[PDB]
């Protein structure tokens, strides 16, 4: 597959992105543990709430599609669908809204994602999303300054950021240390207290973000200047309006 | 020199509009408002009024984190806090409303061929003065024929009247002037012209009944009460018995026949009768709107003045209230009619197609639109790219979105004089967007942005309309805020270039040059201003039947 | 075989075309005339590319009053109506040998337009009709003049009108007798939707064939709603054959008798000595120099009645040559039959009831309009199950030319062109001639 | 046939059916099976027994929560049920040997009503359905028990419920999959307002005959409402083969390879390969490291992107067993495709749009609810011309138990009488074998 059209450095991260075969930079550690904190939907060593019985322990109507379409084990297990909701600065955050979406549903099985303006959200199984959710905390997907985690009060993509670099969060879920140059998540995404603190690291330097950011800005690499990437979406635009009158 | 939002930016912000950083988090919350806090304490009142609890700003996330900005109403050096520009706190947005609502416009040339074929009697200039003179007593809801009548108090209904026009004007000269909405008065030259050969000796009443009825009924209430009085009013000044045969024909006129609503009823998922926002087309709000009578060698003030009327009438009170309710929309609507911002944007892009091509002189094809709306859509996002503040003030996608695909909708209609070309442009803009900065609008935002480009010319059923035509009850735009309203200023935008008197119905532009109404719709985003500032005194208050 | 009434049926001039022919080869369900005219109506379409060609060029489109400056379009529609309803014929068929009809009227001003009844075989209702007619010929139009995709959306809004924003087809240059199914009153009362001054369009102001069409599709609607379904399901059969079929020649024989010199009242007189006469009432009781009528038969004396009042309302209005007294007729022909007799009315009090608010609703300030403008869908005039309507449709078709809001005004487009089906203009011949064709299957 | 274009036909297994079949041998207006569905769905009801008795029994009637004190009437309607049916069916029918249906299910408990085909041969569309079942029943247990003049309107009451105070059959113990004409969003929308639960309740939860009953409901609607004809019927033709009857296997085999270990992105790039495999598309003009593709033939084009959607559906919400992320998957399926080749993608844009506002009204407070609520009637989902909804269906028929308002909670009496039919439960079989035997008539 080939993704995305383009020739600027935002062009081959959102393919990269999307690419299951590109490995994801990873960027930092966090426990099992600490992933289900920052979720909120349950505590460590809970068991998994079930909102309906085991597929085994019901009687599935004969179905090619159910044979042939193998279940992700927290479907298998009956698990709630929860969620995890991420905001990205349009100040040079790596992922971005769309890019997010579109590159869940190249990567990830089970997935119901949803792509807005100052918010992006994945729901599928628990225990599928606490392995999702890992790997969109620990990699590249994340920078701790110009991303967050957040299930409400999301304002911040489009605000200034602080002296610090970090975007604003109405409820400061993650505090930047200025001592330390690290970030401490000291809440979980609904904005209740930790008991104790999950690190996410040093924020990426300037350099770097633009590096791997996926946003055109005049500022970083303008789309106008992208053409390839432009001519695309006017061929789209071109083919739909013909379309839509004969085919 | 500056951006036309230069001003706005600089009084939001201790900033320099240019600067990427700033300090959250210690202005008090809440306190860093003079209208949180004025909320704050009639919470307080409400509640130990009422023995229940009621406003509390300690419920759910605390306000005010960030600054809570003022937004200066495009066009003028009013600025207040975005709640006064929530339609339950601005009685001139209501006012709007309700002048809308309670007007209908009813013709009188069917019922004059029944008094002179049916009744054999004769109409003249004289006869309707005195069936004015009439109508004008018994449409605020008072008696001509029986006894031991019942009335309304006049004070209460003093909003209501009947007044007509027509396009002959030895005519409309020889009728009481004080009835007569003068078209040769109210609008320039080649405007008048142009709707008096419309109108021709064509004769039509445009009918406003009170505001206190329409406040407790609803829009469909309008053309009964109209049919009512002028029916009395025909009994009376014509001599037929008080209910004969062709006392029926006279009601079947004014309520079917020779009728026009404000707006058509809807399905039933939305149920609605007439003249209800949701009815009501992007070229009849364009032409109720008055700017193109006042501003006529401004196209792009007349077009943003008609974007500020349907922004505030279909995302803030259609959308915002008789489609959801609550908190509401007044933002998504406010983007499009304050800080001057959508201002610059389609200033911008009428000075580049005014250079390239010159006004309605580009090709009317998708070479245009590539051109134009690729253009400004191009220096809409590049604003909020340069000015950190434009896009903390913006600062919701749909927002943005909206006001950047109306510079470049609008702005391709300048250049090809078609609304259609311009509807185009305005999808176009929106698939940049995406594309530019990874995001658009709210989770729903572009339901008919993605159907947009297909729909713009299709011809079937359900899709196929011009834009002027089509309104909230086109199946694409049944839903969503950032969009009705802009569609509006869409509408406006080739007749404003080409210099049209009206968009699509010429009654309804005439029908609202009425220096009668209460809201002045010459000056849309003035009178919000006025609303915003408690200085705007609607019709159809109670104080009168009320204890002091 | 479920009743075993038979009736002898008549032509409009008063002969004998059939005798003794059993009542359920007249109902909707079985004759298969009613279900020719009925499945006519569903399909037919008027299409004015007069209008459509002149609504273009004046880009005047959507409405009353409505025009887009800047949007004109000159286009030879009626020039080239022969190639335009061809191509829209090619749409419209499903196969080359179905029963599709586009014929041109006027000179290519208008065209009839029949779509197949296999497009309605596998249809939920009746909108086929126009949607598959309108767009047929919008793409025929814009196909025929290479119109470009920048302003085909105008030759939409000259064919359909401002549908979608309407829920109507507002400003529309075609038009079918039936409305769309979102004006119903109830579930089943589309066929009640057809507006009287249609049906006397339809018929050309021939009164007894108009009052047949009328009773035919306010009948079929009463089996559609299910009102004759059961206990009620021969009195709404007798009252078709009597009251709109001419069974037995009564109504004719009640006008001939009456027509001269006669009234409402002395049609009352001759109807209560026919039905005594016949045995259909007796006298039931005697008071002080006054007679109470009784029946073992309601439904029968219901059906006299009703042709009783088809007889008066054709002797009354067709004395004034004015349609405007069908509701004072329907009125007190009921109000004085019941004094007269001892026995309810027709309808049982709702023709009566019918006739109070119709009386009002074309005399006062609050609604309605003249007799044309009504239908069995009308909140006025919806409440009598089939009895009421027929009435006002022969009061219209006798209308020498009073009302303003007449056939010629309202029904111009419907006249011209459902008036060329045969079905339609002389429904009574047809559907005695399939009760007789059904006469030993029943 | 007016097209040249030949389909294999397979099963929900899998299995080669007939090969080379004429693509209009699955058109609506063609295919014996569509039309016998599609008046199937209009002449059949469901009757609660249970609830009726229930109702009466306390009174409670016309509407939630409601009930008039004093009413109460004690009556074994499920104890004498079979006597209820026979008297009621000696109503609906025409004549004796008809193809009336009435059977009793649950013990009595439930009925299953097909109302003859001979009342909508003669009726504008197809509310008859529940108002002649409903005034039978009525007057069947009016007669059963004998209930008196001045009880009977309760029994009416407990059947019908508000109607007609209100203008929906309010607290109606009868149901059908259509809902009543006054709620289409528009004309010819009929065949559209029935709920994905109800579909998938009547398939009983099997995917593949979901989809395809929700295909050939939809598919069949655009031919009413216009859409199908002239310039787009191609389209819609296969769109319903493709999409909606798993033609030339596309459906089945996008499912099998990507089943295991799959998501959107690996079933576009298998359909992308398939497409260019099959010739449906070719490289159009080569950009940096970015092949542009274009095609001849943008409606096949539609068709294999089409297939696509729906295996993706199937293997998204498959993995999940979870029916909400079929808005997603709408949406992003259609997206990526679109920048994977820059050709339009589903329905050019139309599918991505309806999946944008179906997110939006599944995920917040503002309307709309889960994925079994909508219709192709419904405001939020009427905007794809037939490839939105038949997905849903897919959906909710693989969906594990994650869904509040289920089948189980909507559609509970839909599930028990519609099912029984055997062309609604297993529409892909005798739609399929219908194709076959019409092979060489098309
Ligand atoms: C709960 C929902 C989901 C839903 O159904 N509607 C909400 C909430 C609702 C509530 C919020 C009131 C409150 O706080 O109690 C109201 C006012 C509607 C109402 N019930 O009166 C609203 N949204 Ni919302 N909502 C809006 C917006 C938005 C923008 C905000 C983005 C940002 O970065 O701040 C995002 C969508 C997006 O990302 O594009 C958004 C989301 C949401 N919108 C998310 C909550 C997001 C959060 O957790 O913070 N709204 C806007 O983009 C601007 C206008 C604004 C609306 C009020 C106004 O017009 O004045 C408001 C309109
Ligand atoms: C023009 C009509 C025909 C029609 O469509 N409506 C009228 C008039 C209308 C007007 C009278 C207002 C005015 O005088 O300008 C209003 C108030 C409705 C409106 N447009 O607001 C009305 N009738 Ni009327 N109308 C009434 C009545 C009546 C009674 C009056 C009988 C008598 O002897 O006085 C009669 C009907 C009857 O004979 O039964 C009547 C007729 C009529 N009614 C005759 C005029 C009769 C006359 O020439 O005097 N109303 C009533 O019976 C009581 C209530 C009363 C209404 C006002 C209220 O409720 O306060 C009024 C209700
Ligand atoms: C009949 C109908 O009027 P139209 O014939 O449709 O104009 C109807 N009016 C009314 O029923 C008015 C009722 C109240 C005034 C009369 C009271 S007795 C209405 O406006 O919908
Ligand atoms: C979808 C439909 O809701 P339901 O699904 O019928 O509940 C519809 N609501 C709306 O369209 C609300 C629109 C305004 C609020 C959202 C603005 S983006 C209505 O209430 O008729
Ligand atoms: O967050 S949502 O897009 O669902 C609502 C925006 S107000
Ligand atoms: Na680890
Ligand atoms: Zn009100």
Same mark, same amino acid.
């Given at each position: 597959?080939?993704?995305?059209?383009?020739?600027?450095?935002?062009?081959?991260?959102?393919?990269?992105?999307?690419?299951?075969?590109?490995?994801?930079?990873?960027?930092?550690?966090?426990?099992?543990?600490?992933?289900?904190?920052?979720?909120?939907?349950?505590?460590?060593? /809970?068991?998994?709430?079930?909102?309906?019985?085991?597929?085994?322990?019901?009687?599935?109507?004969?179905?090619?599609?159910?044979?042939? *379409?193998?279940?992700?084990?927290?479907?298998?297990?009956?698990?709630?669908?929860?969620?995890?909701?991420?905001?990205?600065?349009?100040?040079?955050?790596?992922?971005?809204?769309?890019?997010?979406?579109?590159?869940?549903?190249?990567?990830?099985?089970?997935?119901?994602?949803?792509?807005?303006?100052?918010?992006?959200?994945?729901?599928?199984?628990?225990?599928?999303?606490?392995?999702?959710?890992?790997?969109?905390?620990?990699?590249?997907?994340?920078?701790?300054?110009?991303?967050?985690?957040?299930?409400?009060?999301?304002?911040?993509?489009?605000?200034?950021?602080?002296?610090?670099?970090?975007?604003?969060?109405?409820?400061?879920?993650?505090?930047?240390?200025?001592?330390?140059?690290?970030?401490?998540? *000291?809440?979980?995404?609904?904005?209740? /207290?930790?008991?104790?603190?999950?690190?996410?690291?040093?924020?990426? $330097?300037?350099?770097?973000?633009?590096?791997?950011?996926?946003?055109?800005?005049?500022?970083?690499?303008?789309?106008?200047?992208?053409?390839?990437?432009?001519?695309?979406?006017?061929?789209?635009?071109?083919?739909?309006?013909?379309?839509?009158?004969?085919? | 020199?500056?951006?036309?939002?230069?001003?706005?930016?600089?009084?939001?912000?201790?900033?320099?509009?240019?600067?990427?950083?700033?300090?959250?988090?210690?202005?008090?919350?809440?306190?860093?408002?003079?209208?949180?806090?004025?909320?704050?304490?009639?919470?307080?009142?409400? @509640?130990?009024?009422?023995?229940?609890?009621?406003?509390?700003?300690?419920?759910?996330?605390?306000?005010?984190?960030?600054?809570?900005?003022?937004?200066?109403?495009?066009?003028? $050096?009013?600025?207040?806090?975005?709640?006064?520009?929530?339609?339950?706190?601005?009685?001139?947005?209501?006012?709007?409303?309700?002048?809308?609502?309670?007007?209908?416009?009813?013709?009188?040339?069917?019922?004059?061929?029944?008094?002179?074929?049916?009744?054999?009697?004769? *109409?003249?200039?004289?006869?309707?003065?005195?069936?004015?003179?009439?109508?004008?007593?018994?449409?605020?809801?008072?008696?001509?024929?029986?006894?031991?009548?019942?009335?309304?108090?006049?004070?209460?209904?003093?909003?209501?009247?009947?007044?007509?026009?027509?396009?002959?004007?030895?005519?409309?000269?020889?009728?009481?002037?004080?009835?007569?909405?003068?078209?040769?008065?109210?609008?320039?030259?080649?405007?008048?012209?142009?709707?008096?050969?419309?109108?021709?000796?064509?004769?039509?009443?445009?009918?406003?009944?009170?505001?206190?009825?329409?406040? %407790?009924?609803?829009?469909?209430?309008?053309?009964?009460?109209?049919?009512?009085?002028?029916?009395?009013?025909?009994?009376?000044?014509?001599?037929?018995?008080?209910?004969?045969?062709? %006392?029926?024909?006279?009601?079947?006129? &004014?309520?079917?026949?020779?009728?026009?609503?404000?707006?058509?009823?809807?399905?039933? !998922?939305?149920?609605?009768?007439?003249? /209800?926002?949701?009815?009501?087309?992007?070229?009849?709000?364009?032409?109720?709107?008055?700017?193109?009578?006042?501003?006529?060698?401004?196209?792009?003030?007349?077009?943003?003045?008609?974007?500020?009327?349907?922004?505030?009438?279909?995302? =803030?009170?259609?959308?915002?209230?008789?489609?959801?309710?609550?908190?509401?929309?007044? =933002?998504?609507?406010? +983007?499009?009619?304050?800080?001057?911002?959508?201002?610059?944007?389609?200033?911008?892009?009428?000075?580049?197609?005014?250079?390239?091509?010159?006004?309605?002189?580009?090709?009317?094809?998708?070479?245009?639109?590539?051109?134009?709306?690729?253009?400004?859509?191009?220096?809409?996002?590049?604003?909020?790219?340069?000015?950190?503040?434009?896009?903390?003030?913006?600062?919701?996608?749909?927002?943005?979105?909206?006001?950047?695909?109306?510079?470049?909708?609008?702005?391709?209609?300048?250049?090809?004089?078609?609304?259609?070309?311009?509807?185009?442009?305005?999808?176009?803009?929106?698939?940049?967007?995406?594309?530019?900065?990874?995001?658009?609008?709210?989770?729903?935002?572009?339901?008919?942005?993605?159907?947009?480009?297909?729909?713009?010319?299709?011809?079937?059923?359900?899709?196929?309309?011009?834009?002027?035509?089509?309104?909230?009850?086109?199946?694409?735009?049944?839903?969503?805020?950032?969009?009705?309203?802009?569609?509006?200023?869409?509408?406006?935008?080739?007749?404003?270039?080409?210099?049209?008197?009206?968009?699509?119905?010429?009654?309804?532009?005439?029908?609202?040059?009425?220096?009668?109404?209460?809201?002045?719709?010459?000056?849309?985003?003035?009178?919000?201003?006025?609303?915003?500032?408690?200085?705007?005194?609607?019709?159809?208050?109670?104080?009168?039947?009320?204890?002091? | 075989?479920?009743?075993?009434?038979?009736?002898?049926?008549?032509?409009?001039?008063?002969?004998?075309?059939?005798?003794?022919?059993?009542?359920? &080869?007249?109902?909707?369900?079985?004759?298969?005339?009613?279900?020719?005219?009925? =499945?006519?109506?569903?399909?037919?379409?008027?299409?004015?590319?007069?209008?459509?060609?002149?609504?273009?060029?004046?880009?005047?489109?959507?409405?009353?009053?409505?025009?887009?400056?800047?949007?004109?379009?000159?286009?030879?529609?009626?020039?080239?109506?022969?190639?335009?309803?061809?191509?829209?014929?090619?749409?419209?068929?499903?196969?080359?040998?179905?029963?599709?009809?586009?014929?041109?009227?006027?000179?290519?001003?208008?065209?009839?337009?029949?779509?197949?009844?296999?497009?309605?075989?596998?249809?939920?209702?009746?909108?086929?009709?126009?949607? *598959?007619? +309108?767009?047929?010929?919008?793409?025929?139009?814009?196909?025929?003049?290479?119109?470009?995709?920048?302003?085909?959306?105008?030759?939409?809004?000259?064919?359909?009108?401002?549908?979608?924003?309407?829920?109507?087809?507002?400003?529309?240059?075609?038009?079918?007798?039936?409305?769309?199914?979102?004006?119903?009153?109830?579930?089943?009362?589309?066929?009640?939707?057809?507006?009287?001054?249609?049906?006397? +369009?339809?018929?050309?102001?021939?009164?007894?064939?108009?009052?047949?069409?009328?009773?035919?599709?306010?009948?079929?609607?009463?089996?559609?709603?299910?009102?004759?379904?059961?206990?009620?399901?021969?009195?709404?059969?007798?009252?078709?054959?009597?009251?709109?079929?001419?069974?037995?020649?009564?109504?004719?024989?009640?006008?001939? @008798?009456?027509?001269?010199?006669?009234?409402?009242?002395?049609?009352?007189?001759?109807?209560?000595?026919?039905?005594?006469?016949?045995?259909?009432?007796?006298?039931?009781?005697?008071?002080?120099?006054?007679?109470?009528?009784?029946?073992?038969?309601?439904?029968?004396?219901?059906?006299?009645?009703?042709?009783?009042?088809? @007889?008066?309302?054709?002797?009354?209005?067709?004395?004034?040559?004015?349609?405007?007294?069908?509701?004072?007729?329907?009125?007190?022909?009921?109000?004085?039959?019941?004094?007269? %007799?001892?026995?309810?009315?027709?309808?049982?009090?709702?023709?009566?009831?019918?006739?109070?608010?119709?009386?009002?609703?074309?005399?006062?300030?609050?609604?309605?309009?003249?007799?044309?403008?009504?239908?069995?869908?009308?909140?006025?005039? !919806?409440?009598?199950?089939?009895?009421?309507?027929?009435?006002?449709?022969?009061?219209?078709?006798?209308?020498?030319?009073?009302?303003?809001?007449?056939?010629?005004?309202?029904?111009?487009?419907?006249? /011209?062109?459902?008036?060329?089906?045969?079905?339609?203009?002389?429904?009574?011949?047809?559907?005695?001639?399939?009760?007789?064709?059904?006469?030993?299957?029943?």
């Amino acid at each position: 597959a080939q993704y995305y059209p383009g020739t600027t450095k935002v062009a081959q991260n959102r393919r990269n992105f999307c690419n299951p075969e590109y490995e994801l930079e990873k960027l930092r550690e966090i426990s099992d543990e600490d992933v289900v904190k920052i979720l909120g939907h349950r505590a460590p060593g /809970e068991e998994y709430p079930s909102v309906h019985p085991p597929l085994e322990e019901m009687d599935e109507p004969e179905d090619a599609i159910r044979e042939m *379409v193998e279940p992700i084990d927290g479907a298998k297990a009956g698990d709630r669908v929860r969620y995890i909701q991420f905001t990205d600065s349009m100040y040079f955050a790596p992922a971005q809204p769309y890019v997010r979406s579109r590159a869940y549903l190249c990567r990830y099985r089970g997935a119901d994602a949803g792509t807005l303006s100052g918010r992006q959200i994945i729901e599928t199984r628990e225990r599928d999303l606490e392995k999702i959710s890992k790997e969109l905390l620990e990699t590249e997907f994340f920078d701790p300054a110009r991303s967050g985690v957040r299930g409400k009060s999301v304002h911040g993509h489009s605000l200034r950021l602080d002296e610090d670099g970090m975007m604003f969060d109405m409820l400061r879920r993650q505090i930047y240390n200025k001592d330390t140059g690290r970030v401490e998540m *000291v809440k979980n995404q609904i904005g209740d /207290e930790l008991d104790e603190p999950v690190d996410l690291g040093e924020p990426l $330097d300037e350099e770097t973000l633009m590096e791997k950011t996926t946003i055109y800005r005049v500022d970083g690499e303008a789309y106008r200047d992208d053409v390839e990437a432009v001519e695309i979406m006017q061929r789209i635009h071109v083919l739909r309006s013909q379309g839509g009158f004969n085919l | 020199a500056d951006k036309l939002f230069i001003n706005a930016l600089k009084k939001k912000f201790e900033e320099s509009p240019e600067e990427k950083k700033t300090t959250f988090y210690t202005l008090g919350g809440w306190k860093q408002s003079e209208r949180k806090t004025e909320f704050v304490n009639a919470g307080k009142e409400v @509640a130990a009024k009422r023995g229940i609890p009621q406003y509390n700003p300690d419920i759910g996330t605390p306000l005010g984190q960030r600054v809570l900005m003022p937004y200066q109403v495009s066009t003028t $050096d009013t600025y207040v806090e975005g709640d006064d520009l929530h339609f339950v706190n601005n009685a001139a947005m209501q006012q709007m409303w309700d002048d809308i609502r309670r007007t209908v416009i009813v013709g009188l040339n069917h019922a004059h061929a029944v008094i002179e074929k049916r009744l054999g009697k004769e *109409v003249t200039p004289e006869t309707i003065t005195h069936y004015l003179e009439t109508v004008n007593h018994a449409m605020p809801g008072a008696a001509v024929v029986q006894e031991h009548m019942v009335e309304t108090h006049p004070a209460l209904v003093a909003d209501s009247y009947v007044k007509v026009f027509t396009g002959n004007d030895e005519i409309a000269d020889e009728i009481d002037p004080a009835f007569v909405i003068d078209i040769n008065k109210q609008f320039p030259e080649d405007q008048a012209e142009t709707l008096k050969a419309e109108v021709g000796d064509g004769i039509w009443q445009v009918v406003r009944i009170p505001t206190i009825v329409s406040r %407790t009924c609803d829009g469909a209430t309008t053309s009964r009460w109209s049919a009512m009085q002028i029916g009395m009013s025909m009994i009376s000044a014509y001599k037929q018995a008080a209910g004969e045969a062709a %006392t029926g024909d006279f009601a079947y006129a &004014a309520k079917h026949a020779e009728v026009i609503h404000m707006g058509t009823y809807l399905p039933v !998922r939305r149920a609605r009768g007439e003249n /209800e926002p949701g009815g009501v087309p992007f070229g009849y709000l364009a032409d109720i709107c008055q700017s193109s009578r006042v501003n006529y060698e401004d196209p792009v003030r007349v077009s943003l003045d008609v974007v500020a009327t349907g922004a505030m009438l279909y995302d =803030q009170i259609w959308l915002g209230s008789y489609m959801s309710g609550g908190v509401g929309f007044t =933002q998504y609507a406010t +983007a499009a009619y304050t800080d001057n911002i959508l201002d610059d944007f389609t200033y911008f892009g009428k000075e580049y197609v005014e250079d390239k091509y010159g006004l309605c002189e580009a090709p009317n094809n998708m070479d245009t639109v590539l051109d134009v709306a690729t253009e400004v859509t191009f220096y809409g996002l590049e604003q909020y790219e340069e000015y950190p503040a434009l896009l903390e003030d913006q600062f919701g996608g749909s927002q943005r979105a909206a006001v950047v695909a109306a510079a470049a909708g609008c702005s391709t209609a300048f250049a090809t004089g078609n609304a259609q070309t311009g509807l185009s442009g305005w999808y176009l803009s929106m698939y940049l967007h995406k594309e530019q900065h990874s995001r658009l609008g709210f989770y729903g935002y572009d339901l008919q942005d993605q159907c947009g480009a297909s729909n713009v010319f299709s011809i079937r059923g359900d899709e196929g309309l011009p834009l002027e035509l089509r309104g909230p009850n086109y199946p694409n735009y049944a839903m969503n805020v950032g969009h009705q309203g802009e569609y509006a200023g869409i509408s406006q935008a080739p007749h404003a270039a080409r210099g049209d008197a009206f968009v699509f119905n010429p009654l309804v532009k005439i029908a609202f040059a009425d220096d009668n109404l209460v809201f002045d719709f010459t000056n849309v985003r003035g009178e919000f201003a006025k609303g915003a500032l408690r200085e705007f005194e609607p019709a159809g208050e109670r104080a009168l039947i009320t204890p002091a | 075989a479920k009743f075993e009434d038979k009736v002898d049926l008549y032509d409009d001039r008063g002969n004998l075309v059939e005798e003794q022919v059993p009542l359920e &080869a007249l109902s909707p369900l079985r004759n298969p005339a009613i279900k020719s005219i009925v =499945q006519g109506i569903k399909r037919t379409v008027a299409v004015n590319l007069e209008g459509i060609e002149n609504a273009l060029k004046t880009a005047k489109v959507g409405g009353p009053a409505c025009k887009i400056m800047g949007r004109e379009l000159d286009l030879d529609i009626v020039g080239n109506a022969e190639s335009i309803a061809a191509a829209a014929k090619e749409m419209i068929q499903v196969t080359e040998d179905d029963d599709t009809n586009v014929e041109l009227l006027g000179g290519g001003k208008r065209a009839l337009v029949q779509v197949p009844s296999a497009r309605f075989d596998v249809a939920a209702e009746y909108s086929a009709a126009p949607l *598959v007619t +309108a767009t047929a010929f919008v793409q025929a139009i814009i196909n025929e003049f290479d119109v470009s995709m920048y302003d085909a959306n105008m030759v939409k809004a000259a064919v359909l009108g401002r549908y979608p924003q309407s829920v109507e087809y507002m400003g529309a240059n075609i038009a079918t007798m039936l409305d769309i199914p979102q004006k119903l009153e109830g579930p089943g009362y589309a066929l009640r939707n057809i507006m009287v001054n249609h049906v006397v +369009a339809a018929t050309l102001k021939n009164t007894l064939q108009a009052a047949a069409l009328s009773t035919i599709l306010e009948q079929t609607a009463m089996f559609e709603m299910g009102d004759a379904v059961g206990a009620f399901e021969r009195m709404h059969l007798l009252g078709l054959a009597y009251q709109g079929m001419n069974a037995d020649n009564l109504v004719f024989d009640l006008v001939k @008798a009456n027509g001269k010199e006669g009234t409402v009242g002395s049609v009352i007189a001759d109807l209560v000595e026919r039905a005594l006469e016949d045995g259909v009432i007796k006298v039931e009781k005697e008071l002080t120099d006054y007679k109470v009528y009784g029946t073992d038969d309601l439904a029968m004396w219901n059906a006299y009645a009703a042709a009783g009042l088809m @007889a008066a309302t054709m002797v009354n209005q067709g004395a004034a040559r004015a349609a405007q007294g069908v509701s004072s007729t329907l009125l007190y022909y009921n109000d004085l039959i019941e004094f007269e %007799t001892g026995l309810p009315s027709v309808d049982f009090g709702k023709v009566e009831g019918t006739a109070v608010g119709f009386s009002f609703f074309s005399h006062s300030i609050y609604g309605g309009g003249g007799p044309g403008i009504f239908n069995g869908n009308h909140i006025v005039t !919806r409440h009598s199950k089939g009895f009421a309507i027929p009435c006002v449709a022969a009061a219209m078709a006798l209308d020498a030319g009073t009302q303003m809001f007449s056939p010629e005004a309202t029904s111009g487009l419907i006249k /011209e062109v459902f008036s060329q089906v045969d079905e339609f203009r002389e429904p009574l011949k047809y559907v005695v001639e399939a009760a007789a064709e059904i006469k030993n299957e029943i």
